[PDB]
Coordinates of C-alpha atoms and ligand atoms in Angstrom, one line a residue:
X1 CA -16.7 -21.6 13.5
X2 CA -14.0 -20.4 15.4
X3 CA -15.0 -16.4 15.8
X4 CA -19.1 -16.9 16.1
X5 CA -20.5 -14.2 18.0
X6 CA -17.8 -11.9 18.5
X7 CA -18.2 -8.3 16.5
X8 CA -14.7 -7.0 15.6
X9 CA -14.9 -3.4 14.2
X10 CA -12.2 -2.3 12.2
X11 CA -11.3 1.7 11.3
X12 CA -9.3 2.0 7.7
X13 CA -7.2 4.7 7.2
X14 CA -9.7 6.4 4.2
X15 CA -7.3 5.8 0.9
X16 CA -7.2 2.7 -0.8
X17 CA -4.0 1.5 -0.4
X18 CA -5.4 1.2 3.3
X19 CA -8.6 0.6 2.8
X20 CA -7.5 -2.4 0.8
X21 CA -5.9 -4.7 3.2
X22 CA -7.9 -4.1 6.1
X23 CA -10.6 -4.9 3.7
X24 CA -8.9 -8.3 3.1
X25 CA -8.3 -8.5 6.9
X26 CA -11.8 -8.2 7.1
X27 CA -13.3 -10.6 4.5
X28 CA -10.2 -13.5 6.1
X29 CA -11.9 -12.8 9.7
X30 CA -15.4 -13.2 8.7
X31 CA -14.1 -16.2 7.2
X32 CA -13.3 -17.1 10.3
X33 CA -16.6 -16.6 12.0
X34 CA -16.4 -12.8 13.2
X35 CA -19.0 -10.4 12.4
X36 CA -17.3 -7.4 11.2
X37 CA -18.1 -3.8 11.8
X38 CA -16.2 -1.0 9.1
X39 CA -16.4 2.3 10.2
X40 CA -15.4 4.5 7.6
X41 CA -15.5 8.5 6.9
X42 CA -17.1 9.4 3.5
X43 CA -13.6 10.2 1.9
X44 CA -12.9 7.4 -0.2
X45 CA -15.4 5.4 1.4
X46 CA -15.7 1.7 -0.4
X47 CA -19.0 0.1 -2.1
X48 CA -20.2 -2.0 -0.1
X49 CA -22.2 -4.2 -2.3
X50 CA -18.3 -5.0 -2.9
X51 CA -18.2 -6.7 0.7
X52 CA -21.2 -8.2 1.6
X53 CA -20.1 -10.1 3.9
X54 CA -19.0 -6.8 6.1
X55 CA -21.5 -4.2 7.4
X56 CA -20.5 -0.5 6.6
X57 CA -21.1 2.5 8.8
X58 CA -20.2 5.7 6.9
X59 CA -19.3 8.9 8.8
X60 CA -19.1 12.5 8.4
X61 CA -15.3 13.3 7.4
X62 CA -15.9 17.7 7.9
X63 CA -14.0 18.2 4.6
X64 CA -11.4 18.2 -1.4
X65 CA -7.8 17.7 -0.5
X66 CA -4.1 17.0 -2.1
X67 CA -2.7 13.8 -1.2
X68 CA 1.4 14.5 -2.4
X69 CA 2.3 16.9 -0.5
X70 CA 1.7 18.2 2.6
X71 CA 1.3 14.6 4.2
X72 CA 1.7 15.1 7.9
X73 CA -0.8 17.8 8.0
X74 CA -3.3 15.8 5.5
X75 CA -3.0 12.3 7.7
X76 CA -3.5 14.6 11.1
X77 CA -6.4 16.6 9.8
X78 CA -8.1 12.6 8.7
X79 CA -7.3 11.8 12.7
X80 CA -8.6 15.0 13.4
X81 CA -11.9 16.0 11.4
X82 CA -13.6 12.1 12.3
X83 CA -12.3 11.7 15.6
X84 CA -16.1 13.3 16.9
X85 CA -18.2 11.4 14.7
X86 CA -16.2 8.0 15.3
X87 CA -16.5 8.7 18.5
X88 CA -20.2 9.1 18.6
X89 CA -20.7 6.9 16.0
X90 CA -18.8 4.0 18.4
X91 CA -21.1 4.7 20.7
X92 CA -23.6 4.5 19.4
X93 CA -23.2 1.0 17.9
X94 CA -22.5 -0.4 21.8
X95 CA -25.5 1.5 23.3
X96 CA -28.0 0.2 20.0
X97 CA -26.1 -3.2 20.5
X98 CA -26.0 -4.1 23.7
X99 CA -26.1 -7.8 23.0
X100 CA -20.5 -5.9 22.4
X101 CA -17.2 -5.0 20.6
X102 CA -15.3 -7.5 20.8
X103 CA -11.8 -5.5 19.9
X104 CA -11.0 -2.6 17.4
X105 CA -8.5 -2.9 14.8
X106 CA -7.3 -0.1 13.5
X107 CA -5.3 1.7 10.8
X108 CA -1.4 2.5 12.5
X109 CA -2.3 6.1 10.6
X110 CA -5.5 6.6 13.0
X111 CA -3.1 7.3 16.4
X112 CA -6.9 8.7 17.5
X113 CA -8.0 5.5 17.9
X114 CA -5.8 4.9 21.0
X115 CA -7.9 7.6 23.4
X116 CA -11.1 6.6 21.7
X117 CA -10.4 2.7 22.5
X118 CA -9.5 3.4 26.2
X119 CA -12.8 5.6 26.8
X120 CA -14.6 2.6 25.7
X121 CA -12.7 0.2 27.4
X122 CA -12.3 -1.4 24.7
X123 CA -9.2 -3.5 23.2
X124 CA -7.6 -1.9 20.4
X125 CA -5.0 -4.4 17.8
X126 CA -2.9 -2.2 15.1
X127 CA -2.7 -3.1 11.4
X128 CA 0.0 -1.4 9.6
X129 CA -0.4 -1.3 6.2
X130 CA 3.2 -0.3 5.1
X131 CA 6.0 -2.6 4.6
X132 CA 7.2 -4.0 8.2
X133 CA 11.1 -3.4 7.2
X134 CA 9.9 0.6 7.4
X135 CA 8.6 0.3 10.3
X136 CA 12.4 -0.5 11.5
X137 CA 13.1 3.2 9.8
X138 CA 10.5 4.8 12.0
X139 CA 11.3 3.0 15.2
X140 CA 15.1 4.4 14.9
X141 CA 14.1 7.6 13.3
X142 CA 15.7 9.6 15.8
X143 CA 18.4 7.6 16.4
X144 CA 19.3 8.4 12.2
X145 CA 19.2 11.8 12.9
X146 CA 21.6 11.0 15.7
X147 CA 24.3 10.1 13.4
X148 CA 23.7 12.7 10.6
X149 CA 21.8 10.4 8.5
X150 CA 19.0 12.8 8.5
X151 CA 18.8 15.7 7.2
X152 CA 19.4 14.8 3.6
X153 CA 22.3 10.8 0.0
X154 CA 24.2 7.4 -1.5
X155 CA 25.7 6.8 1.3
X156 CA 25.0 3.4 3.4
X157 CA 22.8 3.3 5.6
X158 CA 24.8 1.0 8.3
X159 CA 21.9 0.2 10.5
X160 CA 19.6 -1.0 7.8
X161 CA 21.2 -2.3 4.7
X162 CA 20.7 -2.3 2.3
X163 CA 18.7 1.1 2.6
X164 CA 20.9 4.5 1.7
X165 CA 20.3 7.9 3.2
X166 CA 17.8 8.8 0.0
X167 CA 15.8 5.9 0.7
X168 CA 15.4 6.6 4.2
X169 CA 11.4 7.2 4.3
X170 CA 10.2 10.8 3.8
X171 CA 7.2 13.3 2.9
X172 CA 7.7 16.2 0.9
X173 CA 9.0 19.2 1.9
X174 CA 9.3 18.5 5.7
X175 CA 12.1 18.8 8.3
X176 CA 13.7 15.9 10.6
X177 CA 11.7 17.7 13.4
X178 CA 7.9 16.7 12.4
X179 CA 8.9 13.8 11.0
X180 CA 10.2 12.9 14.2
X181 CA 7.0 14.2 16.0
X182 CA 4.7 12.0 13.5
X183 CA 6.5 9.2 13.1
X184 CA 7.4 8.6 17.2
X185 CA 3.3 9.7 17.1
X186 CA 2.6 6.4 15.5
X187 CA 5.0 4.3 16.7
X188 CA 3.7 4.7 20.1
X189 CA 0.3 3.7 19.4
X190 CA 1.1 0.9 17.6
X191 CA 3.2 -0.1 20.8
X192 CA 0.3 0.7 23.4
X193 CA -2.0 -2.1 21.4
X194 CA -2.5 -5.2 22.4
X195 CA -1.0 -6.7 18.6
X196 CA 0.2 -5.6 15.9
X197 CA -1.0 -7.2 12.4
X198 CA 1.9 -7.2 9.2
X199 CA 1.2 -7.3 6.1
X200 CA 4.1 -9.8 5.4
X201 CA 5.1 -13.4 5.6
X202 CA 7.9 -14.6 7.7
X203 CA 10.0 -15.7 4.6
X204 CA 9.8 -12.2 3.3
X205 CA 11.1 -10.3 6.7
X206 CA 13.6 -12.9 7.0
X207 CA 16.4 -11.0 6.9
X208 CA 14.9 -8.7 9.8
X209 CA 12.5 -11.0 11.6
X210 CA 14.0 -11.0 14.9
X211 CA 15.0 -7.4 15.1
X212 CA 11.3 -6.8 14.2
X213 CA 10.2 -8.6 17.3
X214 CA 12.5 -6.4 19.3
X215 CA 11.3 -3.4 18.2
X216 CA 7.8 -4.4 19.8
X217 CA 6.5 -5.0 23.9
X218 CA 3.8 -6.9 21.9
X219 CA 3.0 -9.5 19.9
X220 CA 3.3 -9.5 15.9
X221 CA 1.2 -11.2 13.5
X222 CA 2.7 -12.1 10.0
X223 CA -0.4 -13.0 8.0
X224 CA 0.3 -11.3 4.7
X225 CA 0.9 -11.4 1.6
X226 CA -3.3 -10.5 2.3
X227 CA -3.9 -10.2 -1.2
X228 CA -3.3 -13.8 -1.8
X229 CA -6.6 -14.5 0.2
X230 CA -15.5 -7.9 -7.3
X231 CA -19.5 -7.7 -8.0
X232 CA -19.1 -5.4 -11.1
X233 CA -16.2 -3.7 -12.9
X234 CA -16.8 -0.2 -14.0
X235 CA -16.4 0.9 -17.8
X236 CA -12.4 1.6 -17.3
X237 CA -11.9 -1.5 -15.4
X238 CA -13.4 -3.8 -17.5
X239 CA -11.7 -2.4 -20.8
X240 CA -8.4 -3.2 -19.2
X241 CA -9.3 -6.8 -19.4
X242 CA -10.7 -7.0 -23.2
X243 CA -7.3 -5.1 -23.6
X244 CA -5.2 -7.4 -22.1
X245 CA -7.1 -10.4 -23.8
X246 CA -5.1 -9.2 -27.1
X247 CA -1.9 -8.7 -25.7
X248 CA 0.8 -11.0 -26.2
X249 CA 2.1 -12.9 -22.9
X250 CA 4.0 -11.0 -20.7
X251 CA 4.3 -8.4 -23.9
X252 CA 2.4 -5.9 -21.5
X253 CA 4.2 -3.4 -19.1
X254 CA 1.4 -2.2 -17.0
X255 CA 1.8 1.1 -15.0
X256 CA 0.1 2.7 -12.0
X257 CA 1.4 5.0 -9.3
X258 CA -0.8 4.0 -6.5
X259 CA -4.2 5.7 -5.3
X260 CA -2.3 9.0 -3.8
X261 CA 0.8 9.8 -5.3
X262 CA 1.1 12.9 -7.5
X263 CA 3.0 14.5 -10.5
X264 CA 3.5 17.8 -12.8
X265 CA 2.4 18.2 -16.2
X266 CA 6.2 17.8 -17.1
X267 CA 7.0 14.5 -15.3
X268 CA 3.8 13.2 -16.7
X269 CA 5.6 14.4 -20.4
X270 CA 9.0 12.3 -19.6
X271 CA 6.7 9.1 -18.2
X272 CA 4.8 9.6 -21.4
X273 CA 7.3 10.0 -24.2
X274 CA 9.8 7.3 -22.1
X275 CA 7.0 4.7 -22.3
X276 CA 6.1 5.8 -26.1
X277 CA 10.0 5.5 -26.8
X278 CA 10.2 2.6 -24.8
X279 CA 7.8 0.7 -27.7
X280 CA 6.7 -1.5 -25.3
X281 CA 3.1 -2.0 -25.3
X282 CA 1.7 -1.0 -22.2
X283 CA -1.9 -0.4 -19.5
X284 CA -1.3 3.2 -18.2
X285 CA -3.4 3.7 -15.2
X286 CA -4.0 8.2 -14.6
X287 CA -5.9 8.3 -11.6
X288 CA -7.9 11.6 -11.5
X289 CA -6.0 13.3 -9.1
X290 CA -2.4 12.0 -10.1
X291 CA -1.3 15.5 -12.3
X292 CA -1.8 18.7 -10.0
X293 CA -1.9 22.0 -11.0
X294 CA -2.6 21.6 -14.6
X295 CA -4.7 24.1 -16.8
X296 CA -5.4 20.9 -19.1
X297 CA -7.9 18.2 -19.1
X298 CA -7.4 14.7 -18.2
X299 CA -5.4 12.5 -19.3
X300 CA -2.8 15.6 -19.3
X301 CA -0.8 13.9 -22.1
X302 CA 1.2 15.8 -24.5
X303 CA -0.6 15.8 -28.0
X304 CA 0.9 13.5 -30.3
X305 CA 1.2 10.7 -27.9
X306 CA -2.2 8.7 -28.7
X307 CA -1.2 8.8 -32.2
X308 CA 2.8 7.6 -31.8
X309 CA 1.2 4.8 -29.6
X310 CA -2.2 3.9 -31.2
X311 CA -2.4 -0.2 -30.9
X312 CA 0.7 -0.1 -28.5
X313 CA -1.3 1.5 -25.6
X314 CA -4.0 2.0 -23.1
X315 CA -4.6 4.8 -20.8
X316 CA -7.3 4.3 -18.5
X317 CA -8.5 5.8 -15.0
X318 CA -8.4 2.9 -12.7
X319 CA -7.4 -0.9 -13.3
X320 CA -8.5 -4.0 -12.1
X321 CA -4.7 -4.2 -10.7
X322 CA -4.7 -7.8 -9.4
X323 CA -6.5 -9.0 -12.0
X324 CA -4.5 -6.9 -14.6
X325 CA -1.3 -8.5 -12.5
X326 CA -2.0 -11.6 -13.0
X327 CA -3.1 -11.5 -16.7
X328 CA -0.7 -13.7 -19.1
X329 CA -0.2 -10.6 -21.0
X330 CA 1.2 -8.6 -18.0
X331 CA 4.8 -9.0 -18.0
X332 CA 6.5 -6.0 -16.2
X333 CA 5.2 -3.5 -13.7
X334 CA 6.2 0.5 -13.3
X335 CA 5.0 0.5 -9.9
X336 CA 5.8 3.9 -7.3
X337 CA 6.7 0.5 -4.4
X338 CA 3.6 1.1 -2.4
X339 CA 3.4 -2.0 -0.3
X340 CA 0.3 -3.0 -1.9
X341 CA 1.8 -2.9 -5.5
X342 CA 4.9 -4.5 -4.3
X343 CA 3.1 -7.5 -2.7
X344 CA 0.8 -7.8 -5.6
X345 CA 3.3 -7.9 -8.2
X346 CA 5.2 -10.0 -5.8
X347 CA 2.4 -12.3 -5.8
X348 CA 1.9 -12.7 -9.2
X349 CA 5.4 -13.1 -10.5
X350 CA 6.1 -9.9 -12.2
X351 CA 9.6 -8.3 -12.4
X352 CA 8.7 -4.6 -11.1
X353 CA 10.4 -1.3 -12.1
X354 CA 10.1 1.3 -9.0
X355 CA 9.5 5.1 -8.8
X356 CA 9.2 5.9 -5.1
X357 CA 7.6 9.3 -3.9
X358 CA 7.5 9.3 -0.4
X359 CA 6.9 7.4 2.7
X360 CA 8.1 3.5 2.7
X361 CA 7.9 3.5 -1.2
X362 CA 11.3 4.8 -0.7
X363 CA 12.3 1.6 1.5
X364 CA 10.1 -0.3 -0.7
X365 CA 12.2 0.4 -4.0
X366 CA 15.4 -0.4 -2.2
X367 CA 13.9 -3.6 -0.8
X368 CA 12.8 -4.7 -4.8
X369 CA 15.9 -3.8 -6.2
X370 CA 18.6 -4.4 -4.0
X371 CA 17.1 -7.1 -1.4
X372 CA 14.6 -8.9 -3.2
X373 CA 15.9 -8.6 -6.4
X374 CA 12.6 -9.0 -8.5
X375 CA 13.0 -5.7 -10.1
X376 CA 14.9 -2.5 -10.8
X377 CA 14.9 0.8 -9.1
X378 CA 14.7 4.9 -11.1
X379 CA 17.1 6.4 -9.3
X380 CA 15.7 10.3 -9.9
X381 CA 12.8 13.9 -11.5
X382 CA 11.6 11.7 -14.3
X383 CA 13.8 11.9 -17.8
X384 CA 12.4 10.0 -20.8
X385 CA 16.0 8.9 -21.7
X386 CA 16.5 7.2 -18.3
X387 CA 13.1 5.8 -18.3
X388 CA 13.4 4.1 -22.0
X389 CA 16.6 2.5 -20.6
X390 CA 14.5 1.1 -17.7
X391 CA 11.7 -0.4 -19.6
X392 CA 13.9 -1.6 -21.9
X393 CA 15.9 -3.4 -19.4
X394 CA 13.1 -4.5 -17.3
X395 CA 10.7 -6.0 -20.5
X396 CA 14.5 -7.8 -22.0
X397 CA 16.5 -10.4 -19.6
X398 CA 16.7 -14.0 -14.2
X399 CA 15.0 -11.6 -12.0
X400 CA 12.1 -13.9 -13.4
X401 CA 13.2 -16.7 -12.2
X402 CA 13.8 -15.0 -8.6
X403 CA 10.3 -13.0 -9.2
X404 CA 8.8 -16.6 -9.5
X405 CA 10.6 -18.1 -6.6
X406 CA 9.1 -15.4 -4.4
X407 CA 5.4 -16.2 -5.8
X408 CA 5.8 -19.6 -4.7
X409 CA 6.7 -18.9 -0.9
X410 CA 3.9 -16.5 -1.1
X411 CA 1.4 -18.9 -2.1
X412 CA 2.8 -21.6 0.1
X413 CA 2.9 -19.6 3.3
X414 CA -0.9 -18.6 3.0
X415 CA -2.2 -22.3 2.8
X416 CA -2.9 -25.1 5.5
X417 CA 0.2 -25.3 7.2
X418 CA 2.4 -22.4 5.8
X419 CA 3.6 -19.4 8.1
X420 CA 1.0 -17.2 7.3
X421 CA -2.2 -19.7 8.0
X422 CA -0.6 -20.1 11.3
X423 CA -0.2 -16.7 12.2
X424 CA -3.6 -15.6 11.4
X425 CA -5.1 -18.6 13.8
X426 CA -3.1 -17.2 16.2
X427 CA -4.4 -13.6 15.8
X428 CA -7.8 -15.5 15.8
X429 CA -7.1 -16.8 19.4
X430 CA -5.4 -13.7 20.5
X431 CA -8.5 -11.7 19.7
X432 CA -11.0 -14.8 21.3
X433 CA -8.1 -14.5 24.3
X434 CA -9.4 -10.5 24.5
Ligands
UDP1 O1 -5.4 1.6 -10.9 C1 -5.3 1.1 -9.8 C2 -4.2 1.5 -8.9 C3 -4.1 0.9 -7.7 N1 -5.0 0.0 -7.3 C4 -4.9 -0.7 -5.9 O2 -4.7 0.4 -5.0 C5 -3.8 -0.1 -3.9 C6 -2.7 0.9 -3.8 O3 -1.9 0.6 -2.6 P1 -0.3 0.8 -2.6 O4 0.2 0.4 -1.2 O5 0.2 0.1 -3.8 O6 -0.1 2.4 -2.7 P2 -0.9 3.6 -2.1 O7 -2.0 3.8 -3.0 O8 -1.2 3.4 -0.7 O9 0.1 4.7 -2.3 C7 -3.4 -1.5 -4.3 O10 -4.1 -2.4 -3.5 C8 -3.7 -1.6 -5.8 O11 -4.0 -2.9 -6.3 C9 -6.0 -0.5 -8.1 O12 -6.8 -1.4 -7.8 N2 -6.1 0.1 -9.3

């Protein structure tokens, strides 16, 4: 097998929608005959009786912490508080191993990978996690503020259609300035690598394939969509599944905003009483952590709700999403266009109806929408009335038939032959190359 003998090591950012594909990354290389190395801070830090196939090294993150606002200084105090003990921790694995790292693939969030890869002389390749047609956004980020894109909001964004100026991609509550700083930041050391991994196919960056190329001294690797390549399901895992079993098909609108995305008691109200309104039945994902600065209990949901919905609903804490995604019951998806969701509902066929926060979701939403076409877009602070009208629309009447053309090329570009397959035997020889 192609990769025997050669440890790879590969650094996730620590949330799950990065955690996630580097994790399939990982499982598709040891696949291919690497032994893999994850190093991971305690934040967030995955089971590994879920991979065991990988070997896990947990460190010290120095830490709770809010993950909707504030982004720029949360992502730099990550790089920051386990740069020391990935550092030590690094080297300690060569010194207790001298019979050697092969490479280090790393999270385009960890920019502190860059000085901790040259110290040890050793070759760094760059997975980004977020959809490739943002990375375009950040590339020309100052070149938007250039001509008064940014600050600020329907208005076309010429250079990158069919994005407008609101779906430019943003973090709460901070100026052109740092995002310039961060985003230039991480577009560097993604340049400096020797690769860069996307988590794409060529069919879907069609439109933008070559200008992606350009935008890189390096090589790219299309080997996406990675969830088209567990052990145990927890309590609120497994119910979603004996839920679904009753369902009717495609009767089921399921809804999750991601692993880090946040909201207000009141939004949380209008999602609520828009989806009870709505009548549709539906698999409600509320993370612990999605409504901040409530006085209330989990689930935060307005009383009367349960009992309006009672046999229409279920609200758990985490679901089984790919699973749930490709249930027969499952047949819409209230996603916040995290590239993870998008690709997985992508992958599974199911028309999508976006509420972007911040960062590519923005992008992402556009791209679903407007580009894609397997899905609609909340344009918006969340109002029941509006959201009705969307579920409505998305669970009624096309974008199917497009949504189902799109799972197709998916599952065709990661078999023998197809785009993808290809480009992840090249990143295999690239890294044998190293
Ligand atoms: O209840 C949930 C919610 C999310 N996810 C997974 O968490 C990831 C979230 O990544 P995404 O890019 O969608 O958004 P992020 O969480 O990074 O904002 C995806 O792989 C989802 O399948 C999951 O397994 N269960």
């Amino acid at each position: 097998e192609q990769g025997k003998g050669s440890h790879l090591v590969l650094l996730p950012l620590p949330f799950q929608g990065h955690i996630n594909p580097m994790l399939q990354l990982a499982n598709l290389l040891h696949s291919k005959g690497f032994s893999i190395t994850i190093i991971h801070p305690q934040l967030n830090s995955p089971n590994p009786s879920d991979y065991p196939n990988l070997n896990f090294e947990i460190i010290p993150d120095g830490f709770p912490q809010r993950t909707g606002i504030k982004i720029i200084e949360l992502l730099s105090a990550v790089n920051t508080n386990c740069e020391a003990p990935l550092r030590e921790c690094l080297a300690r694995l060569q010194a207790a191993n001298p019979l050697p790292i092969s490479c280090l693939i790393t999270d385009a969030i960890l920019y502190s990978t860059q000085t901790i890869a040259e110290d040890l002389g050793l070759p760094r390749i760059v997975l980004r996690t977020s959809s490739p047609f943002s990375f375009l956004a950040f590339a020309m980020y100052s070149h938007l503020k250039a001509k008064g894109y940014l600050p600020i909001s329907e208005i076309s964004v010429v250079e990158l259609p069919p994005l407008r100026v609101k779906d430019l991609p943003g973090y709460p509550n901070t100026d052109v300035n740092a995002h310039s700083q961060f985003f230039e930041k991480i577009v560097n050391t993604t340049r400096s690598a020797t690769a860069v991994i996307l988590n794409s196919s060529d069919h879907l960056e069609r439109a933008i394939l070559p200008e992606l190329h350009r935008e890189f001294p390096i090589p790219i690797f299309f080997v996406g969509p990675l969830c088209k390549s567990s052990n145990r399901l927890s309590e609120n895992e497994q119910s979603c599944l004996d839920w679904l079993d009753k369902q009717e098909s495609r009767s089921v609108l399921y809804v999750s905003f991601g692993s880090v995305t946040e909201m207000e008691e009141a939004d949380l109200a209008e999602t609520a009483w828009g989806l009870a309104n709505s009548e549709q039945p539906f698999l409600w994902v509320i993370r612990p952590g999605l409504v901040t600065g409530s006085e209330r209990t989990w689930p935060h949901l307005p009383e009367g709700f349960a009992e309006k919905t009672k046999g229409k609903g279920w609200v758990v804490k985490w679901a089984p999403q790919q699973k749930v995604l490709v249930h027969p019951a499952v047949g819409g998806f209230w996603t916040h266009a995290g590239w993870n969701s998008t690709l997985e509902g992508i992958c599974s066929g199911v028309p999508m109806i976006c509420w972007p926060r911040n960062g590519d979701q923005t992008v992402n939403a556009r791209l679903v929408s407007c580009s894609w076409k397997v899905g609609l877009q909340l344009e918006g602070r969340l109002e029941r009335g509006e959201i009705e009208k969307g579920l409505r629309k998305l669970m009624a009447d096309e974008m199917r038939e497009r949504a189902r053309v799109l799972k197709e090329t998916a599952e065709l570009c990661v078999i023998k032959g197809g785009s993808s397959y290809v480009a992840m035997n090249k990143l295999v020889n690239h890294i044998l190359s190293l």
